[PDB]
Amino acid sequence: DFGRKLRLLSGYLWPRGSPALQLVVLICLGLMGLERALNVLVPIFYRNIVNLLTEKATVTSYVFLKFLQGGGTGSTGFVSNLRTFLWIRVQQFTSRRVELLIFSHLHELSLRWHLGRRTGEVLRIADRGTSSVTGLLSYLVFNVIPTLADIIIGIIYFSMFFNAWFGLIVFLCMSLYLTLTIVVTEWRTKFRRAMNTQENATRARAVDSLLNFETVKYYNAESYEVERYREAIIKYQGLEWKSSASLVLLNQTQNLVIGLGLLAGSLLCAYFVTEQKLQVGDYVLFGTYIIQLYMPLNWFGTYYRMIQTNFIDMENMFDLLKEETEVKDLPGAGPLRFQKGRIEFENVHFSYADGRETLQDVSFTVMPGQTLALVGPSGAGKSTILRLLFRFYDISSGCIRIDGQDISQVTQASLRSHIGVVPQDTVLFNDTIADNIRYGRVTAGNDEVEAAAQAAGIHDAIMAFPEGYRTQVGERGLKLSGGEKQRVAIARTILKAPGIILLDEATSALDTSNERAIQASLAKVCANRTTIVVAHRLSTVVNADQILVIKDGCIVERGRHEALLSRGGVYADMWQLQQG
Amino acid sequence: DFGRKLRLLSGYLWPRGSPALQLVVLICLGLMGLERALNVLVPIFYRNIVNLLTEKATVTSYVFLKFLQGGGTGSTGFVSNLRTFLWIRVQQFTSRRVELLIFSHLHELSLRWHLGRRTGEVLRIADRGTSSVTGLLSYLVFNVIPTLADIIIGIIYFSMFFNAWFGLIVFLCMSLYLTLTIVVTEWRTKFRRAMNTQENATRARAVDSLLNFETVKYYNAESYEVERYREAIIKYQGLEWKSSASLVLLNQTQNLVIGLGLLAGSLLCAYFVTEQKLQVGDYVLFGTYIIQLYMPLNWFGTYYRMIQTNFIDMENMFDLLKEETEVKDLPGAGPLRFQKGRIEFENVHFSYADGRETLQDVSFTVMPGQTLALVGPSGAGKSTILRLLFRFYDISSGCIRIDGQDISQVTQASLRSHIGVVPQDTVLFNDTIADNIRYGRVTAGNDEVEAAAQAAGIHDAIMAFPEGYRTQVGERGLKLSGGEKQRVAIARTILKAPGIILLDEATSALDTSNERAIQASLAKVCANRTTIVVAHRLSTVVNADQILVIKDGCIVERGRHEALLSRGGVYADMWQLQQG
């Protein structure tokens, strides 16, 4: 409902709790009230000028009128520019507020809603929504309210000038122009759609005839395809002629009824002045005043398709404002009493769909200073289990606790502030390398950045790179090798400094110097730490405290490397798979 | 040079040899001469109206003036619409002529110039060139010549009205407005470029922060990345404020000097009317006339960047009009005396670059009704040799003849009208299947289409397909399997009906029913025909008249399948390769 629209937008014109911009909004509405006042009052002073020309038929008072002509007609576009100039800062604050609100609200967690959507449409609808808000409030307060107020105040000015049929015929003019502009823009839009479809068809046929140059040369369609492409060009250009001729008939019947309204009004004023029943000589006022009233009407009428496009851009954003979470912050959300790092699972379950069991009834209690290593099947059940330690997903039942307390009663940020997960990939934003390291924890100075780079050993890569300690990396910057990308990731987690460690070891192994180097840095970050590792490699699983393979939603075997080799479970099969 | 530009465009306004559209061009220039005549003459009649209002201070002659007011002011935009309405058909013919000219000229053969260019930019520069021609001639004859003619005829009308300093100060106004609009559009363009670069940077940082949702959630950058993204938004929005404020200062100093010019002109006319040294009461004429002169000047000034963009769109198209060929049609280009189909090579060479020898000194004479089968190395030398039988490329030396006469002295179309080459791929245009078959030879009726479909055997696929004999195929239509795509290709070549056959057999083999079916259709098209085959298969090479392997620019062995197996050349090595 438009009542909800107007209430929400009158709220959207309210910046904040600071007294320095509400005053500017008051300046904006003050000049908005001033503009129509001058826009109706200064042609009366033009009428005074020509009337005093007739009555002096004086130069000093005529100059005291001409100064009003100068400072009045040099003020219409000038006050419009001042309005739009402060409207700029209005748009600045409103766009900041709505963009940061929707950018916070698209950073909630609903991952099944996330992953099906690409990033481009998700942020394109956000940009369309903020430019929707901008264009919508600016046009509805700049070219809808003031032009209707101008028409109303023109008819009421005539009602205090002379109450006659003149206001009725001018009202007939403006209403007729409005109605015809709306209905022939509705005539325009189907021609625009058909012309777009035909130009897409002809350009597609053109480029797809150009794609196979060798068969176009193999056959003698050299003079045939130009004829068929000219046929498609004619078939599009006829509809092009129809659309442009529809524009012609729009402007033609528009200017025709404008000329008829000028003719009727000017003849009735001409009859009045030759019959002298009113003040005479005023014909220039009613002459230019119809044009001056009309000049914003096509400025409105070119935006009937635009306001409905703003509506469909803002309504989906309004739906996107307030939707949902997947993990719900329950009340009583408190801190995470990081005593020892002891994580227990008790007959737990999970679903990302209906009856969806990638995990079903596993249970353990991993101790401080000890290491679980996990192999799974050819599936994302391992990463899913890793994500539900993180509470990236939800549980249907069971009991997941960390250090005695359940993971679901608490704040998410105070849960994931004591957690360091190594990802198999590594994003590189288009930025520099000390900011890329401080992405681990942004409260660092550069001393801890350099200390963590010397802890990992990747500072020598920063020596090999140009910019000192600020090497610009990313998509357009300075690129990297994959093990070094994982070295930047482990340097980020080293700077973040948790106690709970969760490695996502890549199945893509590297050179044995790179392999033993990443295992040695994993040792240097994992020594006397509560460590949980998913892996598919050898050196990780031949030393850990317990090795688990979790396939088809269950633990399929339990025990150390010697236990699996002495009982000969599925580790024998995957032993043949790692061999070859 | 602009002299070449004006001469070429005055030629570009000349359609053809038909007397029905040059008359319409005469109508266009007649209304163009009429428009400025009425546009300067009707405010003089407004001046007559208000003057006769003062001198009657009559209604019948005043109505005989008011009818001129009606039919004159209801004619300015009306004659502009009629002009543009016939301008539409002018653009239709000129766009048809230039698009078909450039589409014929981009269908010449320079393949090294072809293949490095993608199709999209090649046709995008063509569309930009035709809209360049459209916008360039329409604006240079509609908003450059007429507004300069309007300013000139206004000053000369004043020179026949009263020769004074009034023309000089109004000329100062129009020239000053023109100069400031040009220089602040030059101020505008750098702000637009910087604003575009900043919005690209902020949206790239936004989407690349959104790309790795899981590491954004893994770290507590949930409240940090909104701050850094707000910092980038502020850094872009400041330049946005600067660009929009530059627009404000453009329109502000514009309307300021417009108000100053109105003030100076109106005061000098006010001094004149209060001193009565001219005809009096005429102040409305000089009042509205400055606005009416000015109204096309910003309509020009918004297109200074546009005309130079039209220039850079048309100049490259002018370079593209007339460039070159790779195979040159020598004079004496005659028919191809298709006696028997006997093709001879005599110490021939080829280069697509400097010192580029993929082929060097091969020589043979292939007979009628007999078959050469060709294997090469892992390279496109085979297809290159196939293309120089076609004369798709050029030769540096040697002697290539077909049926006694050299291939280079003749017309290309009469050479390639007796040639059927099977391509390894098959293009499917977005069209129907009988047109896809008639792509082989467009002079066919549907009887030969159905006869060729029953010759190949693919008419049963048309039975399996919905539309009878007009099944819509291509990129958006009804798709196909690869062997059936080659069946449509061989049906096209069957309809084309040459004598010279050149098969491009795929290395991708199929099922033995599909394999022996395509070999049987190749037999049904190749029986008692002059046949040349490139292949890598078995059934083609175990029966042909001679088998040649051509590697490193030379024939590496010669002989039949039994000859290569009894001498044991490289066919032994490739025998091990086809085995495994």
UniProtKB/Swiss-Prot annotation, chains A, B:
This is ATP-binding cassette sub-family B member 6. Contains two independently folding units, the N-terminal transmembrane domain (residues 1-205) and the ABC-core domain (206-842) are respectively responsible for the lysosomal targeting and the ATPase activity. Residues 66-128, 172-252, 304-580 are cytoplasmic. Homodimer. It is found in: Cell membrane; Mitochondrion outer membrane; Endoplasmic reticulum membrane; Golgi apparatus membrane. Changing V284A: Loss of substrate-stimulate ATPase activity. Impairs protein expression. The keyword DNA damage does not apply. Residues 25-309 form the ABC transmembrane type-1 domain. Changing G341S: May be a modifier of disease severity in porphyria patients; loss of expression. It is linked to Microphthalmia/Coloboma 7: A disorder of eye formation, ranging from small size of a single eye to complete bilateral absence of ocular tissues. Ocular abnormalities like opacities of the cornea and lens, scaring of the retina and choroid, and other abnormalities may also be present. Ocular colobomas are a set of malformations resulting from abnormal morphogenesis of the optic cup and stalk, and the fusion of the fetal fissure (optic fissure). Dyschromatosis universalis hereditaria 3: An autosomal dominant pigmentary genodermatosis characterized by a mixture of hyperpigmented and hypopigmented macules distributed randomly over the body, that appear in infancy or early childhood. The trunk and extremities are the dominant sites of abnormal pigmentation. Facial lesions can be seen in 50% of affected individuals, but involvement of palms and soles is unusual. Abnormalities of hair and nails have also been reported. N-glycosylated. The chain crosses the membrane at residues 24-44, 52-65, 129-149, 151-171, 253-273, 283-303. One of its GO terms (cellular component) is ATP-binding cassette (ABC) transporter complex. It comes from Homo sapiens (Human). ATP-dependent transporter that catalyzes the transport of a broad-spectrum of porphyrins from the cytoplasm to the extracellular space through the plasma membrane or into the vesicle lumen. May also function as an ATP-dependent importer of porphyrins from the cytoplasm into the mitochondria, in turn may participate in the de novo heme biosynthesis regulation and in the coordination of heme and iron homeostasis during phenylhydrazine stress. May also play a key role in the early steps of melanogenesis producing PMEL amyloid fibrils. Belongs to the ABC transporter superfamily. ABCB family. Heavy Metal importer (TC 3.A.1.210) subfamily. One of its GO terms (molecular function) is heme binding. Widely expressed. High expression is detected in the retinal epithelium. Expressed in mature erythrocytes. The keyword Lipoprotein does not apply. Changing A245T: May be a modifier of disease severity in porphyria patients; increases expression; does not affect substrate binding; impairs ATP-binding; Loss of ATP-dependent coproporphyrin III transport; Highly decrease plasma membrane expression. Induction: Up-regulated by cellular porphyrins (at protein level). Up-regulated during erythroid differentiation (at protein level). Induced by sodium arsenite in a dose-dependent manner. GO terms for biological process: brain development; cellular detoxification of cadmium ion; heme metabolic process; heme transmembrane transport; heme transport; intracellular copper ion homeostasis; intracellular iron ion homeostasis; melanosome assembly. It comes from the Eukaryota. The chain holds residues 241 to 827 of 842 of the full protein. Residues 45-51, 150, 274-282 are lumenal. It is a multi-pass membrane protein.
